[PDB]
Structure 1
Amino acid sequence: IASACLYIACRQEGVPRTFKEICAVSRISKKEIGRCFKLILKALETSVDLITTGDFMSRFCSNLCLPKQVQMAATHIARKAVELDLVPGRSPISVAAAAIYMASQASAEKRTQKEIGDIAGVADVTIRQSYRLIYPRAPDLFPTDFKFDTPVDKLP
């Protein structure tokens, strides 16, 4: 119940965390955290605004050593990708991880899928799946005024 309340409060104040970021702190697994979250939302007769991909951008890119420019680039990529429906029905966290990966690979500071998965708590397979959907549309998602040393025109 305490873990569910903490998750609800974090979601409400506008700095939502992921269930995996509360499980890593609490002594229970994600399943019970989610069950108690739903039970509390049902009992309290309250609701929480749906999480957006931009909410996990700042924390994910601050845990990583990415600069602020790469953070803004990833946020813009993810927002445009969700607007363009390139990732239909996929969790916002996977989309955020894919945007962070592409922004890091295109920028001077490069990060592999493993580190991004550990930071965001997303399996590298999910990162690849969410990255291939937005792979062909890499350039138009980037900010127009974006400096880089590794061309956005070529990426893994």
Structure 2
Amino acid sequence: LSTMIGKGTGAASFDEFGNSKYQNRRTMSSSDRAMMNAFKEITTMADRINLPRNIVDRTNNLFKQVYEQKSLKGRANDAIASACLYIACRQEGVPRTFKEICAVSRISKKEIGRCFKLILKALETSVDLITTGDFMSRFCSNLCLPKQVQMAATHIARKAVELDLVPGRSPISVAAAAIYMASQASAEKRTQKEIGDIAGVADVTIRQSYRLIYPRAPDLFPTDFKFDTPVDKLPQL
């Protein structure tokens, strides 16, 4: 409960030498100012990847809960904010990869991961496991691929995960391999560099995921899909 002092209007407002005798001496707490700095940084972070305002509100809620619960005083507020943004994105059913939140933060993957682990421990809550499906609409749309390719990639990644073709591979890597090996089946083609730089995976990760997913090529595609390229014409790395 505080109010500001406006700009000077006349001679009485000013002092002998070019300065106003009343100034904006705010009475904010260190705590309120530090958490307002953090909300302002969260909004800047979220607008970088065009997150909707509801995710920002959820992130603010999680940040306030962590900052009142007071168990992570030693970690930078910007790392706690990044981890909160990751948790909020994951809770809404639209998760972002750790490297995606890293790209819009000064905080590394190491540090945001540790803060995420510690926030989950502190709040005594849990989050759903990411499926190679949620990371599909974005990783595709950004690569500019048709809608039939959306369905092909979603179905094929889901089927590959379902029958346990790929042991222990991260969902990002399986999703990216699905995008690669569903893109060549259509007219629109995408090289390794684009998919790697747009999904965060290295060339060696996508190459060995491709070589693992290749042998079960025809049984994994959807039945009703236009084979612009023959199944046997996919190039093996």
**Range that drifts further, 24-33 or 146-155:** 146-155
Query: Whose radius of gyration is greater, 1 or 2?
Result: 2
C-alpha separation in 2, matches of 1:46 and 1:149: 47
C-alpha separation in 1, matches of 2:108 and 2:208: 25
Instruction: Assess if the C-alpha contact under 8 Å between 1:87 and 1:134 holds in 2.
Output: yes
C-alpha separation in 2, matches of 1:138 and 1:125: 20
Q: CA deviation at 1:101?
A: 0.2
Pairing partner for 1:71 from 128, 139, 150? 150
**TM-score (norm. length: structure 2):** 0.65
Describe the superposition over 1:104-130 as per-residue Cα deviations: whole angstroms up to 9, x where unpaired.
Answer: 111110001111011100001100111
1:25 is matched with which residue? Answer: 104
Q: Larger relative contact order (C-alpha < 8 A, sep ≥ 6)?
A: 1
C-alpha separation in 1, matches of 2:162 and 2:201: 22
Match status 1:13 vs 2:92: yes
**SS of the counterpart of 1:139?**
helix
For structure 2, the 5+ residue unaligned runs are: 1-79
Q: CA deviation at 1:138?
A: 1.1
Instruction: Assess if the C-alpha contact under 8 Å between 1:78 and 1:99 holds in 2.
Output: yes
Match status 1:49 vs 2:128: yes
For structure 1, the 5+ residue unaligned runs are: none
Describe the superposition over 1:114-156 as per-residue Cα deviations: whole angstroms up to 9, x where unpaired.
Answer: 1101110000110011111110011111110110321122201
Pairing partner for 2:191 from 88, 112, 124? 112
Describe the superposition over 1:3-30 as per-residue Cα deviations: whole angstroms up to 9, x where unpaired.
Answer: 0000000000000000000000011110
Q: How does 1:55-134 map to 2 (within 5 A)?
A: 55-134=134-213
1:144 is matched with which residue? Answer: 223
Q: CA deviation at 1:54?
A: 0.3
C-alpha separation in 2, matches of 1:106 and 1:88: 24
Instruction: Assess if the C-alpha contact under 8 Å between 1:106 and 1:155 holds in 2.
Output: yes
C-alpha separation in 2, matches of 1:64 and 1:115: 7
C-alpha separation in 2, matches of 1:136 and 1:148: 17
Q: CA deviation at 1:99?
A: 0.3
Describe the superposition over 1:58-78 as per-residue Cα deviations: whole angstroms up to 9, x where unpaired.
Answer: 011110110011011011110
Identity across the alignment (%):
100
Give the number of aligned pairs: 156
C-alpha separation in 2, matches of 1:84 and 1:113: 26
Instruction: Assess if the C-alpha contact under 8 Å between 1:97 and 1:127 holds in 2.
Output: yes
Instruction: Assess if the C-alpha contact under 8 Å between 1:108 and 1:148 holds in 2.
Output: no
Pairing partner for 1:3 from 82, 85, 90? 82
**SS of the counterpart of 2:231?**
coil
